Amino acid sequence: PLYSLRPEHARERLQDDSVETVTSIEQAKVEEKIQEVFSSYKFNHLVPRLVLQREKHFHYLKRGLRQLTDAYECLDASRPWLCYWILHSLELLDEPIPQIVATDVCQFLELCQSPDGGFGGGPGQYPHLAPTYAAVNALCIIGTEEAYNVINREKLLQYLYSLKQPDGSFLMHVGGEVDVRSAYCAASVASLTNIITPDLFEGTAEWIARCQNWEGGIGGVPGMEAHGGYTFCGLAALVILKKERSLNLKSLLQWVTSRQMRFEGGFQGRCNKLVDGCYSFWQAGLLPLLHRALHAQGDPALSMSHWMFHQQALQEYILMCCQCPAGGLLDKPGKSRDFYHTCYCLSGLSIAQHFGSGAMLHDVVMGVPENVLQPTHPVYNIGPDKVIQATTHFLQKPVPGFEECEDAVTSDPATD
Amino acid sequence: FLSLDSPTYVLYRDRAEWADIDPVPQNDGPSPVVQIIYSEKFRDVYDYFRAVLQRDERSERAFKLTRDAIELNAANYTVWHFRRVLLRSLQKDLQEEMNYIIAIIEEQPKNYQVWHHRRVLVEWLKDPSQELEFIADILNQDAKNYHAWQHRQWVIQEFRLWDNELQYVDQLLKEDVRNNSVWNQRHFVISNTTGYSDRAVLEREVQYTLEMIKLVPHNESAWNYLKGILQDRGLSRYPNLLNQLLDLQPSHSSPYLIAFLVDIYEDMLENQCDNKEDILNKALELCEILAKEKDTIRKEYWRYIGRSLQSKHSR
Numbered sequence: 103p104l105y106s107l108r109p110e111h112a113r114e115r116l117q118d119d120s121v122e123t124v125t126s127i128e129q130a131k132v133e134e135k136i137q138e139v140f141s142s143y144k145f146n147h148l149v150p151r152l153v154l155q156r157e158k159h160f161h162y163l164k165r166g167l168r169q170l171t172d173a174y175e176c177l178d179a180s181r182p183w184l185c186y187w188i189l190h191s192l193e194l195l196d197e198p199i200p201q202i203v204a205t206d207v208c209q210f211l212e213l214c215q216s217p218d219g220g221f222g223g224g225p226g227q228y229p230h231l232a233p234t235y236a237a238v239n240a241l242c243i244i245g246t247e248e249a250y251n252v253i254n255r256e257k258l259l260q261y262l263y264s265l266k267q268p269d270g271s272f273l274m275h276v277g278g279e280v281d282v283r284s285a286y287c288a289a290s291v292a293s294l295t296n297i298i299t300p301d302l303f304e305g306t307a308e309w310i311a312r313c314q315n316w317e318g319g320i321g322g323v324p325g326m327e328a329h330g331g332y333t334f335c336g337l338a339a340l341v342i343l344k345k346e347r348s349l350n351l352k353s354l355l356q357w358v359t360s361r362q363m364r365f366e367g368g369f370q371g372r373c374n375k376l377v378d379g380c381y382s383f384w385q386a387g388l389l390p391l392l393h394r395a396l397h398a399q400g401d402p403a404l405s406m407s408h409w410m411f412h413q414q415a416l417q418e419y420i421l422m423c424c425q426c427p428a429g430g431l432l433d434k435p436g437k438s439r440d441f442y443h444t445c446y447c448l449s450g451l452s453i454a455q456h457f458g459s460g461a462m463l464h465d466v467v468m469g470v471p472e473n474v475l476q477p478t479h480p481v482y483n484i485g486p487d488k489v490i491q492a493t494t495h496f497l498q499k500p501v502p503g504f505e506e507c508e509d510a511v512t513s514d515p516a517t518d
Numbered sequence: 519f520l521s522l523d524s525p526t527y528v529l530y531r532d533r534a535e536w537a538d539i540d541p542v543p544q545n546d547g548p549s550p551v552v553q554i555i556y557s558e559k560f561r562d563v564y565d566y567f568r569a570v571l572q573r574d575e576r577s578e579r580a581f582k583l584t585r586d587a588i589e590l591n592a593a594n595y596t597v598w599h600f601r602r603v604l605l606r607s608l609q610k611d612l613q614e615e616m617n618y619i620i621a622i623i624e625e626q627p628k629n630y631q632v633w634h635h636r637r638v639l640v641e642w643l644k645d646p647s648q649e650l651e652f653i654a655d656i657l658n659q660d661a662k663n664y665h666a667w668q669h670r671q672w673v674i675q676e677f678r679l680w681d682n683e684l685q686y687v688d689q690l691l692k693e694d695v696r697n698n699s700v701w702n703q704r705h706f707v708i709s710n711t712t713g714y715s716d717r718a719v720l721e722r723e724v725q726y727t728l729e730m731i732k733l734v735p736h737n738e739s740a741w742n743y744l745k746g747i748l749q750d751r752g753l754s755r756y757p758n759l760l761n762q763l764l765d766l767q768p769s770h771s772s773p774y775l776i777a778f779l780v781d782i783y784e785d786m787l788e789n790q791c792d793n794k795e796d797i798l799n800k801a802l803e804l805c806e807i808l809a810k811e812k813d814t815i816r817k818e819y820w821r822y823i824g825r826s827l828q829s830k831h832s833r
């Protein structure tokens with residue numbers, strides 16, 4: 103039957119060793135609520151019940167891509183994110199993007215681009231690496247020439263330089279701070295547009311490697327607790343820079359896998375914290391990355407059909423507990439229906455459904471076959487077809503460079 | 519001053535003091551996408567913020583305007599930046615601003631922008647005196663607040679305030695021994711003070727962790743810390759650890775304990791142990807026990823492990 107419904111599954115419930123703390127107490131609560139949801143599917147069935155409410159998701163997305171309620175006022179400095187979240191979800195759901203919105207997205211994003219490089223949270227806002235990453239991803243999802251042509255490549259390079267620090271890290275923005283995520287936004291955006299100069303990421307890989315902590319996972323800055331969001335950015339950034347070996351991959355693999363909740367089936371962001379739909383991507387996204395990494399190093403013990411996590415259990419968690427009746431996906435039952443979770447629960451679901459390593463391909467689609475999502479690139483989190491398309495286009499162009507930096511050193515007015 | 523919910527709140531477009539400036543509305547283009555339907559109050563404040571920002575006006579009025587703008591969207595990094603630029607230009611009272619940010623953080627403890635700003639005020643003032651108390655309070659609301667922990671680590675490193683953190687960590691661990699954030703802080707303090715190579719400290723820690731594991735055998739944090747401080751040193755090199763672990767197997771087992779033993783045997787095999795076969799078999803067994811019964815969610819990982827052990831320690 104379904105992994106989560108099996109009789110023995112009740113054995114996977116929290117054993118608080120009779121020692122109650124806030125953590126166990128909150129964990130038990132989510133497990134009780136989740137069990138209630140599990141029971142429902144065990145109880146009733148005559149027609150297939152694990153179904154991705156595509157229809158309702160599409161309505162939510164199609165509307166959001168155009169107009170948002172003031173509930174979104176709090177994301178007024180995150181508009182290119184809304185564009186990415188939405189367009190990626192649609193892409194995963196296999197909904198084509200009409201030429202009119204495609205062009206409107208492009209034009210809006212053009213308005214979000216700082217004249218000195220990068221993209222801000224909205225028109226006239228200072229550029230910032232998070233919205234820069236989103237904007238480039240969104241334009242790549244659209245994938246037309248009009249979309250590509252929006253990005254001022256020369257200025258974007260200049261902008262990355264303005265944030266690049268001597269120790270290898272990058273500021274989120276001018277006058278901002280650094281974290282593994284900004285390093286990831288720079289590497290993602292620089293590689294897709296083909297603007298990686300010899301020194302752009304100097305020291306970056308070692309800076310990211312220092313973020314990996316005692317748990318095996320990666321914190322936002324050295325010394326910080328291992329966190330799924332940062333760990334994904336860390337490893338993804340190193341894969342782009344071809345420096346994954348800078349990390350202790352073994353303690354990393356052991357850490358992620360431990361992040362899958364035994365009862366719930368979904369992933370938590372940090373050890374001893376609650377399950378959450380978005381981590382279906384942040385955490386599960388690591389497995390295809392680790393799979394590539396280890397495989398390149400010739401690891402012979404690798405599976406040729408499955409990622410190193412319970413693909414089935416994650417899909418069950420997503421389909422049974424992460425869908426909203428009104429449309430959109432969630433953190434967990436009755437918790438956080440927004441475009442962010444819609445994007446990530448879907449991205450995670452698609453990772454859990456498709457496996458590929460070299461020539462080997464093998465899907466695992468729980469519920470109705472109709473549940474299959476288009477595949478997502480585990481590094482950039484946009485369609486693999488879109489990654490290939492963008493890079494091939496940007497590789498037609500030469501990497502930008504500053505000529506004044508290459509000419510002869512001067513020192514005397516006399517020689518003019 | 520005038521709160522946005524005050525019955526007497528006045529829109530900026532109706533304030534005498536702002537009559538000289540023309541607001542700048544946001545241009546979303548002829549056919550917007552992801553367009554937020556802002557309230558009248560939000561769009562009014564931001565129309566004036568755009569006018570103030572555009573002319574880089576460094577005034578007391580522009581300073582007060584940014585407080586409303588932040589109220590409306592405390593995630594707006596452009597507004598936060600401009601307010602700092604104004605704090606400097608107007609030589610504003612930074613302790614006054616510290617009072618402001620203290621109140622705001624207590625309201626939105628999870629907003630990054632808010633902690634970043636407090637960090638700036640702290641370097642500017644070069645005064646970390648309020649820091650540890652304040653963060654402790656916030657951590658009372660949520661002892662796992664990522665941003666609060668990050669700020670705490672920054673204040674401690676920058677101002678070298680290591681003296682009492684290990685005690686603080688001991689306090690919070692009693693409050694909740696499952697708080698992984700606190701187990702991490704423990705590692706942060708120790709690796710930054712005595713370090714772990716001091717065999718006496720390492721001994722203190724392993725013993726401490728073992729007693730912790732004994733009390734709450736299913737708390738993953740303790741297991742993770744234990745492996746954390748010894749993994750790099752070679753798990754099999756500690757014969758007395760292995761015997762104490764096996765001694766837990768009865769009334770204190772868990773998939774963690776079993777997993778740890780697999781690590782020990784994995785290491786033994788790497789270290790070219792004797793009775794290679796006896797060890798590989800003890801490993802592979804625990805691996806199947808984990809894949810098929812005690813840790814099935816990780817069946818894929820454990821099948822990989824067992825497979826790796828065979829791949830390099832057989833025939």
Ligand SMILES: [Zn+2]
Pocket residue numbers: 378379380381433443
């Ligand atoms: Zn979430």
